[PDB]
């Protein structure tokens, strides 16, 4: 019955299938694990996606963001990597335990990046940035396409992100194509927030943060992520449209209804254009599979309607439902509702405290209850998330900054010239 079909240990021998050394489009291979189709986990500190961030030593204290935490020794031992892999897998299972998280994970699995990398109009070809090189026992390399990579954080440990390799001219995260998403995330740390009671000494369920990054990845796999240039400026530091949409709840209403309808119109037209490119496709390059096979795969991804002549079109109501699922249903607020946990009430609650956790032992954190274990002292009043009642599960590493205690007035920033 579980999401992950295998029980993985970091020291298990590689086989070139689901446990193997790999290489990213941009090093020497790193040991990674294929926990599910199209999803891989690299129990390593991310020094590969950005070589400019291949230094784990903390920058000068003036250059440090107020909400940051550094530890160059984290995720360096085989035991640390084993525990990281097990915790990431457990959080994936906890997300899968809910219907919302299962739906999101299904969307991610079937959200294969589009084969729009050919210079010929009628040819379907894969984009190499959406692949990884898997070492074979033979010793050769296999170019395998995928959807999601979960890698440990870089220098800043609590800097969780979802970023993708880009096309030189195309914006794959915004033209409906999609690209393989790499998520900097760690299950060994959690955040504490301060929400007024209607005394806020509660910690974040890391499943909620992983689901946040998974919603980012789901937006970006279907190529509907909001441009990171569309940003609110806060005054009394900025907040992107993407983050506010991703949190959902009341924060999503910072985006005007007219902008939401413009997004819907543009992505309806882009899905129509993708369906038409599938209709006009005649050749396919670089795969055992047939052209109709890739056609059907992307039909199942974008939920295109197929007439009795094989040609594709987008059912308007099915597009509306898919888009509303990806943007309004996949939200942090809905994940808080499903997990029945306590969490920040707005993405604008910038102040965080940094705590160390160990979610792998089932006496500490379970798939169905998180920290609020059944039939325990932790089951009531979210006591499992109380960093003082459940003190055996949280160890304070960084205190609250105290620098974000003011009303957040958001003002849209205008279009700016760029290079």
């Amino acid at each position, epitope marked *: *019955f579980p999401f992950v079909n295998k029980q993985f240990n970091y020291k298990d021998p590689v086989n070139g299938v689901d446990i193997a050394y790999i290489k990213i489009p941009n090093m020497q291979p790193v040991k990674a694990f294929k926990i599910h189709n199209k999803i891989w986990v690299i129990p390593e500190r991310d020094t590969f996606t950005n070589p400019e961030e291949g230094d784990l030593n903390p920058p000068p204290e003036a250059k440090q963001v107020p909400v940051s935490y550094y530890d160059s020794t984290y995720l360096s031992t085989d035991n640390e990597k084993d525990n990281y892999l097990k915790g990431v897998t457990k959080l994936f299972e906890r997300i899968y335990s809910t219907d919302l998280g299962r739906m999101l994970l299904t969307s991610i*699995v079937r959200g294969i990046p589009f084969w729009g990398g050919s210079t010929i109009d009628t040819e379907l070809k894969v984009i190499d940035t959406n692949c990884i090189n898997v070492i074979q026992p033979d010793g050769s390399y296999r170019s395998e396409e995928l959807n999601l990579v979960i890698i440990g954080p870089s220098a800043d440990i609590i800097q969780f992100e979802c970023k993708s390799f880009g096309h030189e001219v195309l914006n794959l995260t915004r033209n409906g194509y999609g690209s393989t998403q790499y998520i900097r995330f760690s299950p060994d740390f959690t955040f504490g927030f301060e929400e007024s009671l209607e005394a806020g000494k509660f910690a974040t369920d890391p499943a909620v943060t992983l689901a946040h990054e998974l919603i980012h990845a789901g937006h970006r796999l279907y190529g509907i992520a909001i441009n990171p240039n569309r940003v609110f400026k806060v005054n009394t530091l900025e907040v992107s449209f993407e983050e506010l949409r991703t949190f959902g709840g009341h924060d999503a209403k910072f985006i005007d209804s007219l902008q939401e309808n413009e997004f819907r119109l543009y992505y309806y037209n882009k899905f129509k254009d993708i369906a038409s490119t599938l209709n006009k496709a005649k050749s396919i390059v670089g795969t*055992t599979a*047939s052209l109709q096979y890739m056609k059907n795969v992307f039909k199942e991804k974008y939920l295109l309607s197929e007439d009795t002549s094989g040609k594709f079109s987008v059912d308007k109501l099915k597009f509306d439902k898919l888009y509303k699922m990806l943007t309004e249903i996949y939200t942090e607020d809905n994940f808080v509702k499903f997990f029945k946990v306590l969490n920040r009430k707005t993405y604008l609650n910038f102040d965080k405290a940094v705590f160390k956790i160990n979610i792998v032992p089932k006496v500490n954190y379970t798939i169905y209850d998180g920290f609020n274990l059944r039939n325990t002292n932790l089951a009531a009043n979210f006591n499992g998330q109380n960093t003082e009642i459940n003190n055996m599960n949280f160890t304070k590493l960084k205190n609250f900054t105290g620098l974000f205690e003011f009303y957040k007035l958001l003002c849209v920033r205008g279009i700016i010239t760029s290079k």
Partner: nanobody
Amino acid sequence: SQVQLVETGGGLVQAGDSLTLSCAATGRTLDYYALGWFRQVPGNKREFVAAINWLGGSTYYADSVRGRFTLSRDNSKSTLYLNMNNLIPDDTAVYYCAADFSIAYSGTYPPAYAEYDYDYWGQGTQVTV
């Protein structure tokens, strides 16, 4: 969880006739799994025959066997059958039967076509025409 796959039926036949290979499965569920068949001639790379998704009967055949080979299932005994019709001398190979798990296999979703997507394998049976 884990599912075991055994393959029976290989043998010697003559060009043009039909044959059926059986893949028996002993696992907990077989739900949300995709069962595929692959060829391998001693020498070249192992190629793909054809696969289904079990839960929602989504089939897919490779262009070497499209229209000739047909997949069929039997849930009375949890078995898979590959019916190879109009066999030709180029079909002589070792046939393997494999399984892959994905939560998206329910319904009309197409199964995987690459060996690496499939994680569980059998020992295979030889077919010579």
